[PDB]
Amino acid sequence: STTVEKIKAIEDEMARTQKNKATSFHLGQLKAKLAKLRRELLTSGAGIGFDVARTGVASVGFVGFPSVGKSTLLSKLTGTESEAAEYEFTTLVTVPGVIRYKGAKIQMLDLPGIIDGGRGKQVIAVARTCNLLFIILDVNKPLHHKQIIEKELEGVGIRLNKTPPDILIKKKEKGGISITNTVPLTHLGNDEIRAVMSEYRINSAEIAFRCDATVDDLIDVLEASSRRYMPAIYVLNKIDSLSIEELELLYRIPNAVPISSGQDWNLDELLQVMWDRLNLVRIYTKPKGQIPDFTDPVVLRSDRCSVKDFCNQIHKSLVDDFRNALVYGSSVKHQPQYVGLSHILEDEDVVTILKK
Amino acid sequence: LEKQPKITLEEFIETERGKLDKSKLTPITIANFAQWKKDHVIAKINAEKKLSSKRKPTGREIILKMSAEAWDLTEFTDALKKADHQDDGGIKDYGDGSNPTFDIKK
């Protein structure tokens, strides 16, 4: 398409343009032109729950180049040997399997489709709607592969291990672009900010920087409705080619879990960290008379754990006859407390619902 | 050693790994890894112990203190866990996540 041709033309220009005081405005506009185009590709009911059935409280995506290490990894994590489709590179997404960890069903997807150089947009949507990604590397040759995986993921608006930047943009009527600043800005000039805002055809606005924002950070904020921020774990396979001191050293890299898929080393850690990053919320049900069961929590998602959500998870009707809920736990500022439907629960809260 | 500066995987490959004297390295055998793992896990436990003292107690933890010292939902819950567990045959259960094993089926 012309739109896919337009992207390559900009990537090309950027690569042959040296970066100085004189070129920075244009390059700022180019980055913005590029960002806008890339979002248009996502523009279309997509991803998990649509393009594949959602089969857990969380869905977790694996991204890696084909290898014996990665096949063994998936087989081992899921308990079932790789199926015919998990060996095809023309295939775009597979489900290696569903696991249960601390009571939560977690769907594990493999996403070879993200690496390929209608259905192409389905794999992208799936990737974007995962709760966590594992990036599988061979620690004997990590850089080339890491660089491609990241480019492809960033390219489709996924932001790995990031919180949205603290920039406020208030759109104005008159008087052009006005800029506020907390911590001094080491990466943006006003020229570049204007470059981005004008490319976005924003005549007049008030922008407040509470972070040492980069030009990409600003763009991310402008593109906030389509950016997907997600935890990613760098799985560094093949540590048996290293040494103890080298292994220790990998733990100085954030979000890395070094493993050996052959020996099983650190698979336990891998799963623990996965759980930690997914931030699911187990609620323990307690009837008025008896105690909470602690055996069968209802597991809610990080961004969907209201008392309302708890109720619905148990049965559609409950909301209609809801008086209130009695809650013990970290979500309430006194033990216990009565709360309403909109009350946001926290992992291992204990809950007793009451009838209207 | 304490709080040490963080590194990238790039930094690791390009400069950090090479600072090491290769003739002093400890082989990563089954035995040496087991010893390293033993200490690794012990540190986690010590780190967690310190965090526990500062974290608000969980609803679970609160009931447990209260223990150690009206809506009948049965029908809906029974049904829910039944549904939740019906496909259990094809799903590997890690339980509480302690001491997992990694046997492959089929």
Short mmCIF file of N, CA and C in Angstrom, two decimals, chain A residues 204-350:
data_model
loop_
_atom_site.label_atom_id
_atom_site.label_comp_id
_atom_site.label_asym_id
_atom_site.label_seq_id
_atom_site.Cartn_x
_atom_site.Cartn_y
_atom_site.Cartn_z
N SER A 204 -2.69 25.33 18.71
CA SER A 204 -2.50 25.98 20.00
C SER A 204 -2.78 25.00 21.13
N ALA A 205 -1.87 24.98 22.11
CA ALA A 205 -1.98 24.08 23.24
C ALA A 205 -1.08 24.48 24.41
N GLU A 206 -1.40 23.94 25.59
CA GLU A 206 -0.59 24.10 26.79
C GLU A 206 -0.07 22.74 27.28
N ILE A 207 1.25 22.58 27.25
CA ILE A 207 1.90 21.31 27.55
C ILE A 207 2.76 21.39 28.81
N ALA A 208 2.48 20.53 29.79
CA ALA A 208 3.21 20.57 31.06
C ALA A 208 4.08 19.33 31.28
N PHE A 209 5.39 19.54 31.29
CA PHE A 209 6.37 18.46 31.45
C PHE A 209 6.81 18.24 32.90
N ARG A 210 6.40 17.10 33.45
CA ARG A 210 6.79 16.70 34.80
C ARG A 210 7.83 15.58 34.77
N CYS A 211 8.48 15.42 33.63
CA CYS A 211 9.49 14.38 33.45
C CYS A 211 10.49 14.86 32.40
N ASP A 212 11.69 14.30 32.43
CA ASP A 212 12.70 14.63 31.44
C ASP A 212 12.34 13.92 30.13
N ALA A 213 11.26 14.39 29.51
CA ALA A 213 10.67 13.71 28.38
C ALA A 213 11.50 13.76 27.12
N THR A 214 11.48 12.64 26.41
CA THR A 214 12.07 12.53 25.09
C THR A 214 11.00 12.88 24.04
N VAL A 215 11.41 13.03 22.79
CA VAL A 215 10.46 13.33 21.72
C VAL A 215 9.46 12.18 21.53
N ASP A 216 9.93 10.93 21.66
CA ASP A 216 9.05 9.75 21.62
C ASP A 216 8.03 9.71 22.75
N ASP A 217 8.45 10.15 23.94
CA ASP A 217 7.56 10.25 25.09
C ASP A 217 6.39 11.19 24.80
N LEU A 218 6.69 12.33 24.18
CA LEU A 218 5.67 13.31 23.83
C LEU A 218 4.70 12.70 22.85
N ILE A 219 5.25 12.07 21.82
CA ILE A 219 4.44 11.39 20.82
C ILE A 219 3.59 10.31 21.46
N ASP A 220 4.18 9.50 22.33
CA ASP A 220 3.41 8.46 23.01
C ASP A 220 2.17 9.05 23.66
N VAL A 221 2.32 10.20 24.32
CA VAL A 221 1.22 10.84 25.04
C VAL A 221 0.13 11.28 24.08
N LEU A 222 0.55 11.93 22.99
CA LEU A 222 -0.37 12.27 21.91
C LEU A 222 -1.06 11.03 21.35
N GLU A 223 -0.35 9.90 21.34
CA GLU A 223 -0.89 8.66 20.80
C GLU A 223 -1.41 7.76 21.92
N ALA A 224 -1.91 8.38 22.99
CA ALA A 224 -2.15 7.63 24.22
C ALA A 224 -3.27 6.64 24.08
N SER A 225 -4.22 6.92 23.20
CA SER A 225 -5.38 6.07 23.12
C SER A 225 -5.06 4.71 22.48
N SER A 226 -3.94 4.63 21.76
CA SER A 226 -3.57 3.35 21.14
C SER A 226 -2.29 2.70 21.69
N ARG A 227 -1.52 3.41 22.50
CA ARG A 227 -0.34 2.78 23.12
C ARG A 227 -0.75 1.72 24.14
N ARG A 228 -0.03 0.60 24.16
CA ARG A 228 -0.30 -0.47 25.11
C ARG A 228 0.96 -0.70 25.91
N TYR A 229 0.90 -0.34 27.19
CA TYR A 229 2.05 -0.46 28.08
C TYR A 229 2.01 -1.82 28.72
N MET A 230 3.11 -2.55 28.63
CA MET A 230 3.09 -3.88 29.21
C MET A 230 4.40 -4.38 29.72
N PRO A 231 4.33 -5.20 30.79
CA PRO A 231 5.49 -5.84 31.38
C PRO A 231 6.04 -6.81 30.36
N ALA A 232 7.36 -6.92 30.30
CA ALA A 232 7.99 -7.90 29.42
C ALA A 232 9.13 -8.48 30.21
N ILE A 233 9.33 -9.78 30.10
CA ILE A 233 10.44 -10.44 30.77
C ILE A 233 11.42 -10.91 29.72
N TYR A 234 12.68 -10.51 29.88
CA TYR A 234 13.73 -10.99 28.99
C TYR A 234 14.24 -12.32 29.50
N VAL A 235 13.89 -13.37 28.78
CA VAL A 235 14.28 -14.70 29.18
C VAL A 235 15.57 -15.04 28.50
N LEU A 236 16.63 -15.19 29.29
CA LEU A 236 17.95 -15.38 28.70
C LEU A 236 18.35 -16.84 28.83
N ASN A 237 18.10 -17.60 27.78
CA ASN A 237 18.35 -19.03 27.80
C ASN A 237 19.82 -19.34 27.61
N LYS A 238 20.19 -20.58 27.93
CA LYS A 238 21.53 -21.12 27.63
C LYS A 238 22.62 -20.67 28.59
N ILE A 239 22.27 -20.44 29.85
CA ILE A 239 23.28 -20.06 30.85
C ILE A 239 24.36 -21.13 31.09
N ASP A 240 24.10 -22.36 30.70
CA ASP A 240 25.10 -23.42 30.88
C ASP A 240 26.35 -23.22 30.03
N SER A 241 26.31 -22.27 29.10
CA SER A 241 27.51 -21.87 28.38
C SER A 241 28.27 -20.75 29.11
N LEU A 242 27.78 -20.33 30.26
CA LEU A 242 28.41 -19.24 30.98
C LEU A 242 29.27 -19.74 32.13
N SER A 243 29.03 -19.19 33.31
CA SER A 243 29.75 -19.50 34.54
C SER A 243 28.92 -18.88 35.66
N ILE A 244 29.25 -19.18 36.92
CA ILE A 244 28.50 -18.64 38.04
C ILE A 244 28.62 -17.11 38.11
N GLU A 245 29.82 -16.58 37.91
CA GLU A 245 30.01 -15.15 38.06
C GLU A 245 29.27 -14.42 36.96
N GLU A 246 29.32 -14.98 35.75
CA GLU A 246 28.59 -14.40 34.62
C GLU A 246 27.09 -14.46 34.87
N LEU A 247 26.60 -15.59 35.36
CA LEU A 247 25.20 -15.71 35.72
C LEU A 247 24.78 -14.62 36.72
N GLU A 248 25.54 -14.47 37.80
CA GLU A 248 25.28 -13.44 38.82
C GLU A 248 25.15 -12.08 38.16
N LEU A 249 26.07 -11.79 37.25
CA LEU A 249 26.09 -10.54 36.52
C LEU A 249 24.80 -10.24 35.71
N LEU A 250 24.13 -11.26 35.18
CA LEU A 250 22.91 -11.02 34.43
C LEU A 250 21.82 -10.40 35.31
N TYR A 251 21.88 -10.66 36.62
CA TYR A 251 20.86 -10.13 37.51
C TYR A 251 21.01 -8.64 37.72
N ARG A 252 22.05 -8.05 37.14
CA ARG A 252 22.13 -6.60 37.15
C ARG A 252 21.34 -5.95 36.00
N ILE A 253 20.76 -6.78 35.13
CA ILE A 253 19.93 -6.31 34.02
C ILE A 253 18.48 -6.39 34.45
N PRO A 254 17.77 -5.24 34.48
CA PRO A 254 16.35 -5.23 34.84
C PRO A 254 15.50 -6.10 33.92
N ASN A 255 14.51 -6.76 34.53
CA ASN A 255 13.49 -7.55 33.84
C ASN A 255 14.05 -8.75 33.10
N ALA A 256 15.22 -9.22 33.54
CA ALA A 256 15.84 -10.39 32.95
C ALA A 256 15.69 -11.54 33.89
N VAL A 257 15.30 -12.69 33.36
CA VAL A 257 15.38 -13.93 34.10
C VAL A 257 16.27 -14.90 33.32
N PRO A 258 17.50 -15.15 33.80
CA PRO A 258 18.36 -16.10 33.09
C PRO A 258 17.95 -17.53 33.40
N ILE A 259 17.93 -18.38 32.37
CA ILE A 259 17.48 -19.75 32.51
C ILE A 259 18.33 -20.74 31.71
N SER A 260 18.07 -22.02 31.92
CA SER A 260 18.51 -23.04 31.03
C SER A 260 17.30 -23.92 30.84
N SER A 261 16.78 -23.97 29.62
CA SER A 261 15.58 -24.75 29.35
C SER A 261 15.86 -26.25 29.37
N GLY A 262 17.10 -26.63 29.08
CA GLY A 262 17.50 -28.03 29.16
C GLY A 262 17.61 -28.51 30.59
N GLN A 263 18.31 -27.75 31.44
CA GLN A 263 18.50 -28.15 32.83
C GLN A 263 17.33 -27.84 33.77
N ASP A 264 16.38 -26.99 33.35
CA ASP A 264 15.26 -26.50 34.21
C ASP A 264 15.64 -25.36 35.17
N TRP A 265 16.91 -24.95 35.15
CA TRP A 265 17.38 -23.88 36.01
C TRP A 265 16.55 -22.66 35.82
N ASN A 266 16.09 -22.11 36.95
CA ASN A 266 15.36 -20.85 37.05
C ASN A 266 13.99 -20.80 36.37
N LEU A 267 13.48 -21.95 35.94
CA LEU A 267 12.09 -22.00 35.47
C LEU A 267 11.16 -21.65 36.60
N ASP A 268 11.50 -22.05 37.81
CA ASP A 268 10.66 -21.70 38.94
C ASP A 268 10.65 -20.17 39.12
N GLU A 269 11.82 -19.55 39.04
CA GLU A 269 11.94 -18.10 39.14
C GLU A 269 11.15 -17.43 38.04
N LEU A 270 11.28 -17.93 36.80
CA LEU A 270 10.54 -17.38 35.66
C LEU A 270 9.06 -17.28 35.93
N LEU A 271 8.48 -18.33 36.51
CA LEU A 271 7.07 -18.32 36.77
C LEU A 271 6.74 -17.38 37.93
N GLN A 272 7.58 -17.37 38.96
CA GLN A 272 7.36 -16.47 40.08
C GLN A 272 7.31 -15.01 39.60
N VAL A 273 8.28 -14.64 38.77
CA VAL A 273 8.36 -13.28 38.29
C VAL A 273 7.16 -12.97 37.41
N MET A 274 6.77 -13.93 36.58
CA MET A 274 5.59 -13.74 35.76
C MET A 274 4.41 -13.38 36.66
N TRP A 275 4.18 -14.20 37.68
CA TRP A 275 3.09 -13.93 38.60
C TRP A 275 3.18 -12.54 39.20
N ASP A 276 4.37 -12.17 39.67
CA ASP A 276 4.58 -10.85 40.26
C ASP A 276 4.20 -9.71 39.31
N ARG A 277 4.55 -9.84 38.03
CA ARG A 277 4.32 -8.76 37.09
C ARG A 277 2.88 -8.68 36.61
N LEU A 278 2.13 -9.78 36.72
CA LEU A 278 0.77 -9.83 36.20
C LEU A 278 -0.20 -9.12 37.14
N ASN A 279 0.19 -8.99 38.41
CA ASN A 279 -0.60 -8.32 39.45
C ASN A 279 -2.07 -8.68 39.49
N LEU A 280 -2.37 -9.97 39.45
CA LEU A 280 -3.76 -10.43 39.52
C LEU A 280 -4.28 -10.30 40.95
N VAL A 281 -5.60 -10.23 41.12
CA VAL A 281 -6.12 -10.15 42.48
C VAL A 281 -7.03 -11.32 42.87
N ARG A 282 -6.53 -12.13 43.78
CA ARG A 282 -7.29 -13.22 44.36
C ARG A 282 -8.18 -12.70 45.47
N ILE A 283 -9.48 -12.95 45.35
CA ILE A 283 -10.40 -12.61 46.41
C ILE A 283 -10.84 -13.90 47.05
N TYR A 284 -10.91 -13.93 48.37
CA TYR A 284 -11.32 -15.12 49.10
C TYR A 284 -12.71 -14.91 49.65
N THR A 285 -13.62 -15.80 49.28
CA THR A 285 -15.01 -15.66 49.66
C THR A 285 -15.19 -16.23 51.04
N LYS A 286 -15.99 -15.53 51.84
CA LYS A 286 -16.30 -15.91 53.22
C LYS A 286 -17.79 -15.77 53.45
N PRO A 287 -18.47 -16.89 53.80
CA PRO A 287 -19.87 -16.79 54.20
C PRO A 287 -19.97 -16.21 55.61
N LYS A 288 -21.12 -15.61 55.93
CA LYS A 288 -21.32 -14.94 57.22
C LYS A 288 -20.89 -15.83 58.40
N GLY A 289 -21.44 -17.04 58.47
CA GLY A 289 -21.13 -17.97 59.55
C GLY A 289 -19.72 -18.52 59.50
N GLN A 290 -19.41 -19.25 58.44
CA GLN A 290 -18.16 -19.99 58.36
C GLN A 290 -16.96 -19.11 57.95
N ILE A 291 -15.81 -19.74 57.71
CA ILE A 291 -14.56 -19.05 57.41
C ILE A 291 -14.34 -18.95 55.90
N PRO A 292 -13.32 -18.17 55.46
CA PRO A 292 -13.00 -18.14 54.04
C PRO A 292 -12.32 -19.44 53.65
N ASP A 293 -12.46 -19.85 52.39
CA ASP A 293 -11.97 -21.17 51.98
C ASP A 293 -10.47 -21.23 51.65
N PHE A 294 -9.92 -20.12 51.14
CA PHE A 294 -8.49 -20.01 50.78
C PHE A 294 -8.01 -21.02 49.74
N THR A 295 -8.84 -22.02 49.46
CA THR A 295 -8.55 -23.04 48.46
C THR A 295 -8.93 -22.57 47.05
N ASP A 296 -10.08 -21.90 46.93
CA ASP A 296 -10.57 -21.48 45.62
C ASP A 296 -10.84 -19.99 45.55
N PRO A 297 -9.78 -19.18 45.38
CA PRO A 297 -10.02 -17.75 45.17
C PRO A 297 -10.71 -17.46 43.84
N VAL A 298 -11.51 -16.39 43.79
CA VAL A 298 -11.88 -15.84 42.50
C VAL A 298 -10.79 -14.86 42.08
N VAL A 299 -10.26 -15.06 40.89
CA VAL A 299 -9.14 -14.26 40.46
C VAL A 299 -9.62 -13.20 39.48
N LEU A 300 -9.32 -11.95 39.80
CA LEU A 300 -9.72 -10.82 38.99
C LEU A 300 -8.51 -10.18 38.31
N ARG A 301 -8.73 -9.49 37.20
CA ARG A 301 -7.64 -8.78 36.53
C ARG A 301 -7.28 -7.46 37.23
N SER A 302 -6.04 -7.05 37.05
CA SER A 302 -5.49 -5.82 37.65
C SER A 302 -6.39 -4.60 37.46
N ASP A 303 -6.94 -4.44 36.25
CA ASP A 303 -7.77 -3.28 35.90
C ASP A 303 -9.29 -3.56 35.89
N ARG A 304 -9.70 -4.60 36.61
CA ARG A 304 -11.09 -5.04 36.62
C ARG A 304 -11.35 -5.84 37.89
N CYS A 305 -11.17 -5.18 39.03
CA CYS A 305 -11.33 -5.88 40.29
C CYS A 305 -12.19 -5.11 41.28
N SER A 306 -13.25 -4.49 40.76
CA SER A 306 -14.20 -3.84 41.63
C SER A 306 -15.06 -4.90 42.30
N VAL A 307 -15.66 -4.54 43.43
CA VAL A 307 -16.64 -5.41 44.08
C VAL A 307 -17.70 -5.80 43.03
N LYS A 308 -18.08 -4.83 42.20
CA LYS A 308 -18.94 -5.05 41.03
C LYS A 308 -18.42 -6.19 40.15
N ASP A 309 -17.12 -6.17 39.87
CA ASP A 309 -16.50 -7.19 39.02
C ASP A 309 -16.46 -8.54 39.71
N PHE A 310 -16.19 -8.53 41.01
CA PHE A 310 -16.26 -9.74 41.82
C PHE A 310 -17.63 -10.39 41.70
N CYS A 311 -18.67 -9.58 41.93
CA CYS A 311 -20.06 -10.06 41.86
C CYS A 311 -20.35 -10.72 40.52
N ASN A 312 -20.04 -10.00 39.44
CA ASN A 312 -20.32 -10.49 38.10
C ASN A 312 -19.56 -11.77 37.80
N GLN A 313 -18.33 -11.84 38.27
CA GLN A 313 -17.51 -13.03 38.10
C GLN A 313 -18.21 -14.26 38.72
N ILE A 314 -18.95 -14.04 39.80
CA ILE A 314 -19.64 -15.14 40.49
C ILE A 314 -20.98 -15.49 39.84
N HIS A 315 -21.79 -14.47 39.54
CA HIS A 315 -23.05 -14.67 38.82
C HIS A 315 -23.71 -13.39 38.41
N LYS A 316 -24.14 -13.34 37.15
CA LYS A 316 -24.75 -12.15 36.54
C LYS A 316 -25.73 -11.35 37.41
N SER A 317 -26.57 -12.06 38.17
CA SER A 317 -27.72 -11.47 38.87
C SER A 317 -27.40 -10.66 40.13
N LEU A 318 -26.34 -11.06 40.83
CA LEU A 318 -25.95 -10.52 42.15
C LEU A 318 -26.05 -9.00 42.34
N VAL A 319 -25.67 -8.24 41.32
CA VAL A 319 -25.70 -6.77 41.35
C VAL A 319 -27.09 -6.22 41.69
N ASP A 320 -28.12 -6.87 41.16
CA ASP A 320 -29.51 -6.44 41.32
C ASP A 320 -29.99 -6.47 42.77
N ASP A 321 -29.47 -7.41 43.55
CA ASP A 321 -29.89 -7.58 44.94
C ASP A 321 -28.75 -7.30 45.93
N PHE A 322 -27.81 -6.47 45.51
CA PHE A 322 -26.63 -6.15 46.31
C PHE A 322 -26.96 -5.08 47.32
N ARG A 323 -26.78 -5.38 48.61
CA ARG A 323 -26.88 -4.36 49.66
C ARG A 323 -25.51 -3.69 49.81
N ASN A 324 -24.52 -4.48 50.24
CA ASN A 324 -23.13 -4.05 50.33
C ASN A 324 -22.19 -5.23 50.58
N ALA A 325 -20.89 -4.95 50.73
CA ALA A 325 -19.89 -5.99 50.95
C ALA A 325 -19.00 -5.71 52.15
N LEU A 326 -18.74 -6.76 52.93
CA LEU A 326 -17.83 -6.70 54.05
C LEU A 326 -16.46 -7.18 53.61
N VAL A 327 -15.45 -6.34 53.81
CA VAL A 327 -14.11 -6.60 53.30
C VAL A 327 -13.05 -6.46 54.38
N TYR A 328 -12.24 -7.51 54.53
CA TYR A 328 -10.98 -7.43 55.26
C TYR A 328 -9.88 -7.36 54.23
N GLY A 329 -8.86 -6.55 54.49
CA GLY A 329 -7.68 -6.55 53.64
C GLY A 329 -7.07 -5.19 53.35
N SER A 330 -6.05 -5.20 52.51
CA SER A 330 -5.24 -4.02 52.25
C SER A 330 -5.98 -2.94 51.45
N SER A 331 -7.14 -3.28 50.90
CA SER A 331 -7.90 -2.33 50.10
C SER A 331 -8.77 -1.38 50.94
N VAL A 332 -8.94 -1.71 52.22
CA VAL A 332 -9.78 -0.89 53.11
C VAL A 332 -8.97 -0.32 54.27
N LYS A 333 -9.33 0.87 54.73
CA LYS A 333 -8.47 1.55 55.69
C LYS A 333 -8.81 1.24 57.16
N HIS A 334 -9.70 0.27 57.36
CA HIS A 334 -10.11 -0.22 58.68
C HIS A 334 -10.61 -1.64 58.56
N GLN A 335 -10.33 -2.48 59.56
CA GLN A 335 -10.64 -3.91 59.42
C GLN A 335 -11.79 -4.38 60.30
N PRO A 336 -12.90 -4.82 59.69
CA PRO A 336 -13.23 -4.77 58.27
C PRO A 336 -13.93 -3.47 57.93
N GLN A 337 -14.43 -3.38 56.71
CA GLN A 337 -15.22 -2.23 56.31
C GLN A 337 -16.32 -2.62 55.33
N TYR A 338 -17.47 -1.95 55.43
CA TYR A 338 -18.49 -2.13 54.40
C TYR A 338 -18.17 -1.22 53.23
N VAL A 339 -18.34 -1.77 52.03
CA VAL A 339 -18.04 -1.04 50.81
C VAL A 339 -19.14 -1.25 49.77
N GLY A 340 -19.10 -0.43 48.72
CA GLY A 340 -20.02 -0.50 47.59
C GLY A 340 -19.43 -1.14 46.35
N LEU A 341 -20.27 -1.27 45.33
CA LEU A 341 -19.93 -1.93 44.07
C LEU A 341 -18.65 -1.41 43.43
N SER A 342 -18.42 -0.10 43.53
CA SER A 342 -17.29 0.52 42.86
C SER A 342 -15.98 0.37 43.62
N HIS A 343 -16.03 -0.23 44.81
CA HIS A 343 -14.83 -0.39 45.63
C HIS A 343 -13.86 -1.31 44.95
N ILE A 344 -12.63 -0.83 44.80
CA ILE A 344 -11.56 -1.57 44.14
C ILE A 344 -10.79 -2.48 45.10
N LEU A 345 -10.87 -3.79 44.85
CA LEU A 345 -10.24 -4.77 45.73
C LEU A 345 -8.74 -4.95 45.44
N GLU A 346 -8.08 -5.66 46.35
CA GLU A 346 -6.64 -5.91 46.26
C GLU A 346 -6.34 -7.35 46.61
N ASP A 347 -5.25 -7.87 46.05
CA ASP A 347 -4.89 -9.27 46.20
C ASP A 347 -5.06 -9.76 47.64
N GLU A 348 -5.81 -10.86 47.78
CA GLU A 348 -6.04 -11.56 49.05
C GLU A 348 -6.91 -10.80 50.06
N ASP A 349 -7.68 -9.82 49.59
CA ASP A 349 -8.84 -9.33 50.33
C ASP A 349 -9.79 -10.50 50.60
N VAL A 350 -10.46 -10.46 51.75
CA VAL A 350 -11.50 -11.43 52.08
C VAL A 350 -12.86 -10.72 52.03
#
